[PDB]
Amino acid sequence: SNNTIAIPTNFSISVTTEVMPVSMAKTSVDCTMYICGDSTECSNLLLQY
Amino acid sequence: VVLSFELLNAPATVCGPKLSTELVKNQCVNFNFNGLTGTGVLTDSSKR
Ligand SMILES: *[C@@H]1O[C@H](CO)[C@@H](O[C@@H]2O[C@H](CO)[C@@H](O)[C@H](O)[C@H]2NC(C)=O)[C@H](O)[C@H]1NC(C)=O
């Protein structure tokens, strides 16, 4: 209506939880051990990559 | 003669003539068990 307004007569204090990711697990790969295991022969072929 | 092989996870029935060495545990070694060969450290195990 062009001539009426609603005013809050009261209030509520609210506490709200916002959860945010900030980091992830730091990961490391031994690329030689993953590809070749311990085999010397494969490690020599891997050098060619 | 046609020799047909199978190389299963089952007891070795025919083997090549390789001489066999003592176990060397707790060291990184080359190994060859029934032709299954690799490199690593051998230890006792609990495995069933
Ligand atoms: C807003 O509403 C709350 C209730 O929802 C009012 O608090 C009540 O106030 C009466 C009278 O003061 C008490 O008898 C009640 O016990 C109160 N309840 C609670 C939960 O506090 C509050 O007064 C209102 N705020 C304003 C500014 O009027």
mmCIF file of C-alpha atoms and ligand atoms in Angstrom:
data_model
loop_
_atom_site.group_PDB
_atom_site.id
_atom_site.type_symbol
_atom_site.label_atom_id
_atom_site.label_comp_id
_atom_site.label_asym_id
_atom_site.label_seq_id
_atom_site.Cartn_x
_atom_site.Cartn_y
_atom_site.Cartn_z
ATOM 1 C CA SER A 1 0.000 0.000 0.000
ATOM 2 C CA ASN A 2 1.327 3.416 -0.982
ATOM 3 C CA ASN A 3 0.862 4.877 2.521
ATOM 4 C CA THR A 4 1.770 2.176 5.083
ATOM 5 C CA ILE A 5 5.124 0.936 6.377
ATOM 6 C CA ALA A 6 6.117 -2.023 8.549
ATOM 7 C CA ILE A 7 8.671 -1.239 11.274
ATOM 8 C CA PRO A 8 10.361 -3.952 13.381
ATOM 9 C CA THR A 9 9.307 -3.634 17.013
ATOM 10 C CA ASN A 10 11.873 -6.204 18.213
ATOM 11 C CA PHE A 11 15.012 -8.058 17.197
ATOM 12 C CA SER A 12 16.900 -11.331 17.540
ATOM 13 C CA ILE A 13 20.629 -11.682 17.961
ATOM 14 C CA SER A 14 21.582 -14.527 15.628
ATOM 15 C CA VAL A 15 24.806 -16.517 15.466
ATOM 16 C CA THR A 16 25.380 -18.314 12.167
ATOM 17 C CA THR A 17 28.112 -20.796 11.256
ATOM 18 C CA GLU A 18 29.946 -20.475 7.936
ATOM 19 C CA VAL A 19 32.368 -23.315 7.151
ATOM 20 C CA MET A 20 35.144 -22.666 4.639
ATOM 21 C CA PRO A 21 37.971 -24.870 3.319
ATOM 22 C CA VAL A 22 41.376 -23.202 3.526
ATOM 23 C CA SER A 23 43.934 -25.899 2.697
ATOM 24 C CA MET A 24 44.267 -29.396 1.288
ATOM 25 C CA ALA A 25 46.619 -32.269 2.033
ATOM 26 C CA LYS A 26 50.120 -31.496 0.814
ATOM 27 C CA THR A 27 51.108 -34.370 -1.470
ATOM 28 C CA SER A 28 54.451 -35.581 -2.811
ATOM 29 C CA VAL A 29 55.231 -38.170 -5.492
ATOM 30 C CA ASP A 30 58.523 -39.941 -6.060
ATOM 31 C CA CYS A 31 57.968 -40.174 -9.806
ATOM 32 C CA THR A 32 60.784 -42.710 -10.219
ATOM 33 C CA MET A 33 59.558 -45.019 -7.452
ATOM 34 C CA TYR A 34 55.972 -44.831 -8.706
ATOM 35 C CA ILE A 35 56.869 -45.656 -12.308
ATOM 36 C CA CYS A 36 59.811 -48.030 -11.960
ATOM 37 C CA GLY A 37 59.677 -49.362 -8.452
ATOM 38 C CA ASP A 38 63.261 -50.246 -7.605
ATOM 39 C CA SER A 39 64.122 -51.891 -10.927
ATOM 40 C CA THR A 40 67.341 -50.440 -12.324
ATOM 41 C CA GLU A 41 66.455 -51.490 -15.873
ATOM 42 C CA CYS A 42 63.227 -49.488 -15.950
ATOM 43 C CA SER A 43 64.953 -46.489 -14.360
ATOM 44 C CA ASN A 44 67.376 -46.451 -17.303
ATOM 45 C CA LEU A 45 64.464 -46.406 -19.741
ATOM 46 C CA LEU A 46 62.769 -43.690 -17.697
ATOM 47 C CA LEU A 47 65.789 -41.434 -18.214
ATOM 48 C CA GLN A 48 64.878 -41.492 -21.909
ATOM 49 C CA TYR A 49 61.675 -39.629 -21.011
ATOM 50 C CA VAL B 1 57.596 -80.741 -30.049
ATOM 51 C CA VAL B 2 55.471 -77.841 -28.814
ATOM 52 C CA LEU B 3 56.100 -76.913 -25.194
ATOM 53 C CA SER B 4 53.154 -75.003 -23.743
ATOM 54 C CA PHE B 5 53.868 -73.273 -20.438
ATOM 55 C CA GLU B 6 51.829 -71.725 -17.694
ATOM 56 C CA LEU B 7 53.292 -69.390 -15.072
ATOM 57 C CA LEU B 8 50.625 -69.359 -12.374
ATOM 58 C CA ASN B 9 50.640 -68.489 -8.687
ATOM 59 C CA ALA B 10 51.022 -72.213 -8.064
ATOM 60 C CA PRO B 11 53.876 -74.524 -7.080
ATOM 61 C CA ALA B 12 56.796 -74.690 -9.484
ATOM 62 C CA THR B 13 56.790 -77.967 -11.411
ATOM 63 C CA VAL B 14 59.656 -77.459 -13.878
ATOM 64 C CA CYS B 15 62.605 -75.143 -13.327
ATOM 65 C CA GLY B 16 65.649 -73.856 -15.132
ATOM 66 C CA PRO B 17 69.088 -74.975 -13.981
ATOM 67 C CA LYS B 18 70.006 -71.960 -11.813
ATOM 68 C CA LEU B 19 72.112 -72.606 -8.739
ATOM 69 C CA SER B 20 70.521 -71.326 -5.545
ATOM 70 C CA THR B 21 72.035 -68.967 -2.968
ATOM 71 C CA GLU B 22 71.443 -68.360 0.729
ATOM 72 C CA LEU B 23 68.801 -65.923 1.934
ATOM 73 C CA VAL B 24 70.050 -62.400 2.671
ATOM 74 C CA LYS B 25 67.497 -60.686 4.909
ATOM 75 C CA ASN B 26 67.255 -57.040 5.990
ATOM 76 C CA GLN B 27 69.370 -55.859 3.036
ATOM 77 C CA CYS B 28 68.305 -54.449 -0.298
ATOM 78 C CA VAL B 29 69.117 -57.212 -2.778
ATOM 79 C CA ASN B 30 68.246 -58.580 -6.148
ATOM 80 C CA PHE B 31 66.154 -61.704 -5.712
ATOM 81 C CA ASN B 32 64.748 -64.512 -7.828
ATOM 82 C CA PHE B 33 62.183 -66.916 -6.356
ATOM 83 C CA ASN B 34 61.054 -69.586 -8.828
ATOM 84 C CA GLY B 35 61.887 -67.107 -11.578
ATOM 85 C CA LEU B 36 59.846 -64.351 -9.929
ATOM 86 C CA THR B 37 62.632 -61.775 -9.712
ATOM 87 C CA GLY B 38 62.839 -58.266 -8.344
ATOM 88 C CA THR B 39 64.714 -55.999 -5.968
ATOM 89 C CA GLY B 40 63.883 -55.173 -2.373
ATOM 90 C CA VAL B 41 64.415 -56.016 1.281
ATOM 91 C CA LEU B 42 63.523 -59.504 2.487
ATOM 92 C CA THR B 43 62.176 -60.059 5.999
ATOM 93 C CA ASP B 44 60.165 -62.655 7.849
ATOM 94 C CA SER B 45 56.420 -62.098 7.703
ATOM 95 C CA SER B 46 53.211 -62.908 9.551
ATOM 96 C CA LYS B 47 51.315 -63.561 6.309
ATOM 97 C CA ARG B 48 49.031 -66.554 6.125
HETATM 98 C C1 LIG C 1 11.351 -9.094 22.142
HETATM 99 O O1 LIG C 1 10.668 -10.306 22.468
HETATM 100 C C2 LIG C 1 11.176 -10.979 23.623
HETATM 101 C C3 LIG C 1 10.443 -12.294 23.717
HETATM 102 O O2 LIG C 1 10.450 -12.976 22.470
HETATM 103 C C4 LIG C 1 10.967 -10.091 24.836
HETATM 104 O O3 LIG C 1 11.530 -10.746 25.967
HETATM 105 C C5 LIG C 1 10.503 -11.041 26.932
HETATM 106 O O4 LIG C 1 10.121 -9.858 27.642
HETATM 107 C C6 LIG C 1 9.109 -10.051 28.646
HETATM 108 C C7 LIG C 1 8.859 -8.702 29.278
HETATM 109 O O5 LIG C 1 10.060 -7.953 29.402
HETATM 110 C C8 LIG C 1 9.547 -11.115 29.654
HETATM 111 O O6 LIG C 1 8.463 -11.397 30.532
HETATM 112 C C9 LIG C 1 9.980 -12.389 28.943
HETATM 113 O O7 LIG C 1 10.501 -13.320 29.885
HETATM 114 C C10 LIG C 1 11.044 -12.070 27.910
HETATM 115 N N1 LIG C 1 11.455 -13.277 27.214
HETATM 116 C C11 LIG C 1 12.718 -13.524 26.855
HETATM 117 C C12 LIG C 1 12.957 -14.822 26.145
HETATM 118 O O8 LIG C 1 13.627 -12.735 27.091
HETATM 119 C C13 LIG C 1 11.646 -8.745 24.636
HETATM 120 O O9 LIG C 1 11.298 -7.869 25.702
HETATM 121 C C14 LIG C 1 11.243 -8.096 23.309
HETATM 122 N N2 LIG C 1 12.058 -6.921 23.054
HETATM 123 C C15 LIG C 1 11.584 -5.673 23.118
HETATM 124 C C16 LIG C 1 12.568 -4.582 22.827
HETATM 125 O O10 LIG C 1 10.413 -5.437 23.395
#
